[PDB]
Amino acid sequence: RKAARGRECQVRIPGVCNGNPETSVLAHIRKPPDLIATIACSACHDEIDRRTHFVDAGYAKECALEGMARTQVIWLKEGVI
């Protein structure tokens, strides 16, 4: 599942997102399981982890978890899970 590298960001915080799938990683939602994670570009990853705080933490969290649900939905369709 850590092979979400090079996929589209599912977090997509406006402004913060870089939209560049080359930067995408499996970003764990806060040894946590890879299921409980979202594909996130480098920028969104730093924001959802609160290494940056460009946006409100509730909104970041909302986007992170929305991203997690989209990611799991991708895994479902693709046969990954």
CB atoms within 10 A of CB 34: 13
Q: Which is nearer to Zn ion, 41 or 64 (CB)?
A: 41
Going from the C-alpha of 13 to that of each of 28, 31, 74, 76, 80, the distances in angstroms are: 16, 25, 19, 23, 25
Residue 28 known to be catalytic? yes
3-state SS assignment for residue 42: helix
17 annotated among ligand-binding-site residues: yes
Instruction: List the structure tokens of 39.
Output: 């594909």
Q: Considering only the stretches 8-16, 17-25, 42-50, 65-73, report the one whose residues sit in contact with a second copy under the rule CB under 8 A.
A: 65-73
Contacts to a second copy from residues 1-60, by CB under 8 A: 29, 33, 35-36, 58-59
What residues make contact with a second copy under the rule CB under 8 A?
Answer: 29, 33, 35-36, 58-59, 61-62, 65-66, 68-69, 72-73, 76, 81
Active site residues: 28
